[model samples]
Target: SMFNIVRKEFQFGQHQVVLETGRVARQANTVLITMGGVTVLVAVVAAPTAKAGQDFFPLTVNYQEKQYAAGRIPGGYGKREGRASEAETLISRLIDRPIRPLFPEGYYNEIQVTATVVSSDKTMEADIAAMLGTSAALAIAGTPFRGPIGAARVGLINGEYVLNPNFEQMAQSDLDLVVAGTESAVLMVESEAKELSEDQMLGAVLFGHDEMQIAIQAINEFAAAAGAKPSDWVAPAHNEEKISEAYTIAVKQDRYAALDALHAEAVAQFADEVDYLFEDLKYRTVRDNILSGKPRIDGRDTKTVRALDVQVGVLERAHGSALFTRGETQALVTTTLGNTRDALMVDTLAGTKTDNFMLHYNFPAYSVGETGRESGPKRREIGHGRLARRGVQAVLPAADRFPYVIRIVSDITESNGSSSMASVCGASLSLMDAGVPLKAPVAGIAMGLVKEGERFAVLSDILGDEDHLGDMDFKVAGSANGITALQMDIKIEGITEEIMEVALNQAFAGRMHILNEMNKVISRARPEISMHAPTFEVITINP
Candidate 1:
């Protein structure tokens, strides 16, 4: 169903503006090509068939920016993009989460949309262009999608919005927000506000979304002209009866009561003691019973969140610190602001660059009451730390917005389950405690799945043993309004959309509860950063 599209080319205000499509990936269902001095190739593909006896649609979106796009050489000895840099992987997830939910049910085809930077212009931000390209591709693909999304990068400079802002221009902006939306509404937004009220934050998102509407329509026109017919994607069939049974059991009346009544004192003094007292017997019994949603250590239900406690500014000498305790799990997070020179330099498959924000989560030998060799950070540590970074990064003041390269470390001083989530919660508190003036608070939660022959349990804020023994490790990091980052690794190749949906709902509930508790202790960011922290200054230089 491809048609003719008019490519726009113009010289404006001492600069050139060129809009083009269908140069690359034209064979794809939809392809939108863009060059802002740098050629960027975007392709969209969808799976042709859905599996039988499946319950949910699975879609993966990968957005990659190549170093070669900028006519730049690789930085490290490998002389390659090496691996998906932390920022790259995180951004990929960022682009995937918002739109994934917008697709209708029974559209279970595996859709993977990729944005590869073919070229780069020093004056432009490629992220926004890639975003628009993806939006255009999806809209034109004729898929049963709810959108043609428009995206823009917003910089708050001298109290006004700067559209499609550049990296250098970002340094002068007090707020940095990237927002995407449909013609009538916003679909995704990520930002870090500086001492702005809640209304101001919401307004920024709305304004950014409104500003991008024309871009969204432009994509629609491009798609109508050059896009191909979308592949007929068949969705998987799910056993409605079985899923209902599982959901019912998960939220049973008695289970709900038990979970709500689950306080730190009762679970700590009673169920935990018995489990410890009869470790072997309890392990088998709990596995057989709890894994099936029949019973738990505290006799609570699957959707339960344990007794939680949070404290900020816990370490006097530390730059910023917070102690977050969820059930028996705990994370002590601290923030250390750094000079520009200390930024984390990453040499990746895409390029070599420095990261201003670094988050590390540690599980010490004593946290779990176990003694093991203390060595360098492992993959789990790196992964968990990255999640915490992703969660809080949504609210961090921009480089120019805050003018500081910052590091936040979350040490798991105690453990039971979901330390990474606890770390996320604690890091937000630590940043606010440090007077960072983050746009909004971000929270995280880890969910687990136990599926044995259709007998399944999706536990919210799961414990370590549950995660280790469970079939899935799904980590979600986001703000109250929207998701920032999400990671899922399943023993099975995929999960049902119903399961994912429930997990998301449960995580949101848990996150809100945690945030409410946090607000009770400290509602706003502190007025000053810790005196012990390093000083970071930002200045514009003439070329």
Candidate 2:
């Protein structure tokens, strides 16, 4: 058993990068990955039987950074781990986005992947390291995952790109870009830049992509040496084919025939007279048209954005409110300014900290014409809220200049596509209405990718259908000068550097268009807030 363990090492800047598997957690699926003073364990488990009446894939990815990982008890009532930390929540998403697309389509098995940081060096960041371990775990598990993905952090320091830069090095860098992908293409990208140029950003992504190749190669080699065969998990048979035929006959009889009368009630109820099979057919139709050249579901050009409407101060009682409607998506955003006493206290393995600015997002079932259970905020809600928060936080006034706790709520009143981006746009307007003197007016746009081998298309302000059928969901949020936050997830293995460059440029053009539309109502922050809002006077003392 001891001899079966596999270990490999590679050079990472000033330290030696080591990865180990088949030595621990072998009972569940995979084992701990040891890199320097950091060690992480990733385990995956899937239900033996599939649940009936499930139309969507349910895959959960969880990541935890325990205080014991750093050899200390977390500061709490019982000094124990609690609910997922915001940092853990965000990192879990980073791991989920890339691996999610790799699962086989139509596979509805309830699968869960959990990654725990068992040890930490404290000096090195563990998020990216955990991401690498997740990929390795799935690769070694008998779960048919199209993995072997790798992640690398690229930092720009003094006009140079540094790969896997440590926390200290990152402080001096202007760009912090984390890129994950397979050997050939990029799967996910998350970054925040300091007004860097498009070319510079493109370079950072490309550099990270290249550097990650080594890690992926090592994972593959390790998996091969471990020799774990995938389990016999097969897709369940369904009546989609029969349903398609029946729907075809019904449509042939009459274009407007009642789908319910033909015993297709499930289909009719699911998508308003169109079943899942028919939706796929429609997706193919739209996709083919885009590949052939210059065609959109709404008849807009490839680079065109949807119609935009903005309104502020819609709610009389609220301190500040805004309604942003773009195409079919809408966000009812509100801003509340409070004293520093209202700040949120967060506990993490590192230490305790206070969050002055917070953003919360909600998506009701009626937002998309569906009826589901009304419950607490789900993972999707948390992820979208964090994204919008990053977008608005970039332009917020300094703590000394405006020392008040900021809370923004973005409620999705309608949904189609880019509702998160709509939240970013609405949040900025609401803050301006609250007289917060932002550095600049910020806006966001969602860019979609439709790639078919040699031919490809980049779409701005994509529709819901396009996002479902397309190859990429790339959301960019920023102001007129530069980007504040950006997230990219690809369904395919990866995209080339050239395509990513084009997407960034296209998003910039679309974001500017949105800003121009928002300026029509209000160009800058108001001189004074509402009468109901709080007013403060500065006080100084000589020492």
Candidate 3:
């Protein structure tokens, strides 16, 4: 009663899109967005000024799902929400990726966006709802965000696209694509398809883009009517001279050292400047060369992959070990065999469950030519591991058919690009090496894009440097026949389905190329598990 409240609703598919601002978190830059039974409250708090010597943007997005939102109590003794669940962490990434790039470069002010699920309808998901609130919160907060972007889930049921599909609908759909973008271009896409052709995938993306555009326009209208005057903030200034000088040094020897020095100097010269200036210049030089049809930094063609070398039985006495190297990236993957006793026990709201197959990915700083203290797995590690797991999981033997527990560890020795894909490749090799009887081999590749207006280039098996300078990082993992898992993150507003179709085809070719290289080292699973590995036998018991 004390604060004014403004609410607006729009028709979204069969459901309603309702958003309310003011009242609840008037003190904070906030928005309460609701879609059907799903509701999310997103708040943004950014410091007026950036911290000194901040080299990178300090933006953090936290998505928390409260048990009470689902009308359930905490399952554990703590009786409270503790650490974020894997689903929550992934949702946080979904929200963080699209908006992070929207902020102006060199805007290093510490900004934290928190999205809490206030309510959840079992049928209507909360991830996209949280994303809507995220963009709205930042847009109205007056942050230097070129946003008002929208997110939606596209499902293909009997070849028809459905926007904001319900849980049941999604289950029946063969193609599930989660798309996020502004009115003009797509920013992010995470999907799992059932061997859908390139055209089907492209159609799904375009359908979702059109539907999301309506939501984005509606959000912009609401913010304009109810949003407060943006707080005054200073924009970062560009140092052309410094940037030009850094480019010259980057071309000379000691690329890393020169770039690091340039960044340190720039950080001191202009408190507002980010380290991206030097990186951008260095990347721009290479990007221009590519545009001019110059060979990639390593002298590869647009569709050519780097030299590959693979070796199995690299570790003595291990169940299964393989060394997979593609150009600069290398992963030593090992497969460990165990029984049901070693299955991972997981406690969830529904109940306790056990996992028989697990894949763990690790990246030591040394892999990137850096020296740092070793610590537990961070979100990057978790994300990479999950991606690799999905790639290889497609070919795993059915649990009932083979009851042995499995664990694959991918230790990254070096990295340039697609280390996670390397893990996928290496894990497959190791699984075959261990005589795991995998259904088929799998391989992955990271594809990149560089677009200046209508002109766009898709680079197969992109280098790390290319990923930094490029606009899109689309990774695909699967068997030689079709895609099993896919992830795409776009920096531009949205990419046309034509471009996406090209990328899909290009990725398909790239993956096949990698798979061919993989077969050279080992073609199929061995007849039996290695003698050095633990052995077990299965017997039936009647009750």
Note the Cα lDDT for every prediction shown: 0.66, 0.80, 0.81
Question: Considering TM-score, which of the candidate structures 2 and 3 is the better prediction for this target?
Answer: 3
Q: Pick the lDDT winner.
A: 3
Per-residue alpha-carbon lDDT of model 1 for 151-242, expressed as tens digits? 77676788777776666677786566677666765555555544343344445665776777667666666555554355465544443321
Residue-level lDDT of model 2, residues 98-180, one tens digit each, is: 88887777666787889999888776678777888888877777675777899988888999999888778888987778889
lDDT of 3: 0.81
Summarize candidate 3's per-residue lDDT along 307-326 as a digit string, tens digits. 88989999997789999998
Model 3 TM-score (2 dp): 0.88
Query: For model 1, what is the alpha-carbon lDDT of residue 180?
Result: 65
What candidate 3 gets wrong by more than 4 Å, as runs, is: 52-55, 228-236, 239-280, 347-353, 530-543
Each prediction's TM-score versus the true structure: 0.59, 0.88, 0.88
lDDT-wise, the better of 1 and 2 is 2
Tell me which of candidates 1 and 3 scores higher on TM-score: 3
Top-TM-score structure, candidate number: 3
lDDT of 1 at 203: 55
Off by over 4 Å in 2: 1-3, 46-57, 106-110, 228-276, 538-543
